[PDB]
Amino acid sequence: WEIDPKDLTFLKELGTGQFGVVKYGKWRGQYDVAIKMIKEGSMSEDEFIEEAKVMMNLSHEKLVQLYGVCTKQRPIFIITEYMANGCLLNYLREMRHRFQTQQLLEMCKDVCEAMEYLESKQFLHRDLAARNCLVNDQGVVKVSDFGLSRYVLDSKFPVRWSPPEVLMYSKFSSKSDIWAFGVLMWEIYSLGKMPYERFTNSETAEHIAQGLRLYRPHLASEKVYTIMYSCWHEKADERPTFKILLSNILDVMDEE
């Protein structure tokens, strides 16, 4: 999985992402790639490198494709699929798109397929959120930065995407990714509002401890809201699987 860094040509600076700066470039003079440069001193490097190599074997149309790494230098580079329309959160917030609700539901379908695949590999994302999803030139949404929070050494914790058992007991599971997916659906249908937008993280955790929830964005139909709401059952084991959520999303697409 080691890419020769001399096969890379850097062409545009894209800004700072989670975990470090990202550039647009070409691999072998020809093929578009993104290059993420891991901030020095930020990662448990040996762990990160061993898992990166494992994660290289994950492949799905709706996961941002990992191509390779450059680890014989510092900073470490990660070479991935280039997603021309950038972060989903920013894309949602661009009012110029004038999105139809069918487009919003398709964004949810895209993410749900990626998550069903990760679930089928028993691999948790751990920080699923619109900020971490990316959009390609065809408007397809793909999931990225899965698993990576595990290597960050060591105000940043995803309180607003976490279920009660995480906030109270640090109980992480497939069902905490389910919860997060529901919040992501809310982000999509709210055109990128911050969840609990007028609450602090502290206030959010307290509201969640009291059993209270996000409510229906204006653009979410009753059927769509029912799906996102199902991700927030108090009891983790009554929350659906990604396979069930996908089937529910497909049914709505076929109806609405």
**Is 18 a known ligand-binding residue?**
yes
Q: Which of residues 143-162 bind ligand 5WF (CB under 6 A)?
A: 144-148
Q: Is 122 annotated as a binding residue?
A: no
Helix, strand, coil share (%) of the chain residues, nearest 5: 45, 20, 40
Helix axes 174-189, 242-255, angle to 10 degrees: 30
Determine the distance from the C-alpha atom of residue 34 to the mean position of all C-alpha atoms in its chain, rounded to a whole number.
Answer: 17
Among 64, 105, 118, 228, binds ligand 5WF (CB under 6 A): 64
In the complex, minimum distance from the CB of residue 157 to ligand 5WE, in angstroms, rounded to a whole number: 32
Minimum distance of ligand 5WE from residue 65's CB (angstroms): 5
Question: What's the CA gap between 14 and 112, in Å, rounded?
Answer: 26
Residues that bind Cl ion (CB under 5 A): 13, 21
Q: How far is CA 221 from CA 35, 128, 171, 227, in A?
A: 39, 23, 32, 10
Q: Within 13 Å and on the Cβ side, how many CA atoms surround 256?
A: 19
Map residues 82-111 to x or -, x wherever contact with ligand 5WF holds by CB under 6 A: xx--xx--x---------------------
Indicate which residue of 4, 46, 127, 154 is catalytic. 127
- Output the smallest distance, CB 91 to ligand 5WF, in A: 8
**Interface segment toward ligand 5WF; rule CB under 6 A; list 2-10, 76-84, 155-163, 206-214:** 76-84
In the bound state with ligand 5WE, the residue whose beta carbon lies nearer, of 35 and 178, is 35
Tell which positions 176-215 bind ligand 5WF, by CB under 6 A.
none
The count of other CB atoms within 10 Å of the CB of residue 87 is 21
Residue 49 has which token pair?
Answer: 């490198």
The Cβ of residue 214 has, within 10 Å, a number of other Cβ atoms equal to 23
Which of 3, 35, 43, 159 is in the footprint of ligand 5WE by CB under 6 A?
3
Does 148 appear as a known binding residue? yes
Clarify whether 251 is annotated catalytic. no
The residue with tokens 């001193």 is 41
